[PDB]
Amino acid sequence: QEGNGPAAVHYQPASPPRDACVYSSCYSEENVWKLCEYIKNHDQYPLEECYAVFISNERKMIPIWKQQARPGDGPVIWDYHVVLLHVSSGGQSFIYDLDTVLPFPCLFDTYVEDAIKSDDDIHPQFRRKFRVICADSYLKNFASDRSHMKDSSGNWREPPPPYPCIETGDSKMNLNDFISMDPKVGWGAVYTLSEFTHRFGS
Amino acid sequence: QEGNGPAAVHYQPASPPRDACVYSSCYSEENVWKLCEYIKNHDQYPLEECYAVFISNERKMIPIWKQQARPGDGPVIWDYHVVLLHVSSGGQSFIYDLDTVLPFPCLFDTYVEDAIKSDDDIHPQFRRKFRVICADSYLKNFASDRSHMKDSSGNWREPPPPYPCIETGDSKMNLNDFISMDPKVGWGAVYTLSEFTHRFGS
């Protein structure tokens, strides 16, 4: 028998701690994009091991439990919500959600169970779908002019993030193409809750 | 009526107290063999209720927390480690580890939870595997010439136990066959951490 030298044996998060991440309430698509930017700019993990994940449905009403906005367990009904998925080297997958009360990051199995619960127990208009976009692709292609966050009067529904709107060489606004769950549109692949769970679950 | 709560269920230990057990640091395989020999030579419990348990992995680096060699400070990373498992007629199972800072013996659910933790977020190279050998079989078959404990110059890595090497009619050395977590090799059965915990846990 011999005791080896000390070593870090646990998964190391790809992000900064939850309280050190760039964040604006109601701009999860951006918060997630910012995590992608951080990962890209660091050498800990390849960017391609990560995915931006949009959650929505045709009716744009998805319940998510264990959300910060509503502490104590009823759900928040969102039009869409975005989280980050890290498909880690050992078959262990993690979810980074800046709006969850669950750990940041959180093991995938735990997150999907606690946050989402079962689609079977809710009516069809509320069922959850997921667009999974590889992080490199997301940085390359995502663009939002934040126009959706201004009311009829031109005032901000929620204050915007402190940096200029994300744009690309090809577009200044394509957020709807990410929110959409039609496989004929946008980038990445679309999965039902069951499919998503099976695909990235343990 | 008598009610307790798992940690409070009554149990009489199969060994002498920790301070009276034969023990050499870095020779857990031998320390456990000696415990098996003691049990055999006593009439308290049938030997067949007990198992020698080897803990290792392919890379031979396994973390174990609550270890004497590293008080309060993370895990010890062992090439391999050996403990005794008593499957009690009392319905609760116990772990005897001469190297733990937990009680000796310790209720199984508690030992695994504190000492082992989960492999859910542990790097692949560090995941724990268990070889469980019924105690009668261990005494019948185990042999070690202690050759692994001599360095390249022929000197001891750690001082040996002060009794002659354990040998059998069939071998002078088969320690590698116990350390191995290959089911094709050796005696007993091999389990993942999850399997081991589900099997012997509550």
Curated annotation (Swiss-Prot), chains A, B:
Organism whose genome encodes this protein: Homo sapiens (Human)
Documented EC number(s): 3.5.1.122
Gene field: NTAQ1
Keywords on record: Cytoplasm, Hydrolase, Nucleus
Organism placement in taxonomy: Eukaryota, Metazoa, Chordata, Craniata, Vertebrata
GO CC annotations on file: cytosol; nucleus
GO molecular function: protein-N-terminal asparagine amidohydrolase activity; protein-N-terminal glutamine amidohydrolase activity
Role, per record: Mediates the side-chain deamidation of N-terminal glutamine residues to glutamate, an important step in N-end rule pathway of protein degradation. Conversion of the resulting N-terminal glutamine to glutamate renders the protein susceptible to arginylation, polyubiquitination and degradation as specified by the N-end rule. Does not act on substrates with internal or C-terminal glutamine and does not act on non-glutamine residues in any position. Does not deaminate acetylated N-terminal glutamine.
Gene Ontology process terms (BP): protein modification process
Subunit-level organization: Monomer.
Protein's name according to its UniProt entry: Protein N-terminal glutamine amidohydrolase
Catalytically driven reaction(s): N-terminal L-glutaminyl-[protein] + H2O = N-terminal L-glutamyl-[protein] + NH4(+)
Record carries keyword Nucleus: yes
Primary location recorded for the protein, binned into one broad class: cytoplasm
Cell location: Cytoplasm, Cytosol; Nucleus
EC class (word): hydrolase
Active-site positions on this chain: 28, 81, 97
Family that this chain belongs to: Belongs to the NTAQ1 family.
Pfam families: Nt_Gln_amidase (PF09764)
InterPro entries: N_Gln_amidohydro_ab_roll_sf (IPR037132), NTAQ1 (IPR039733), Prot_N_Gln_amidohydro_ab_roll (IPR023128)
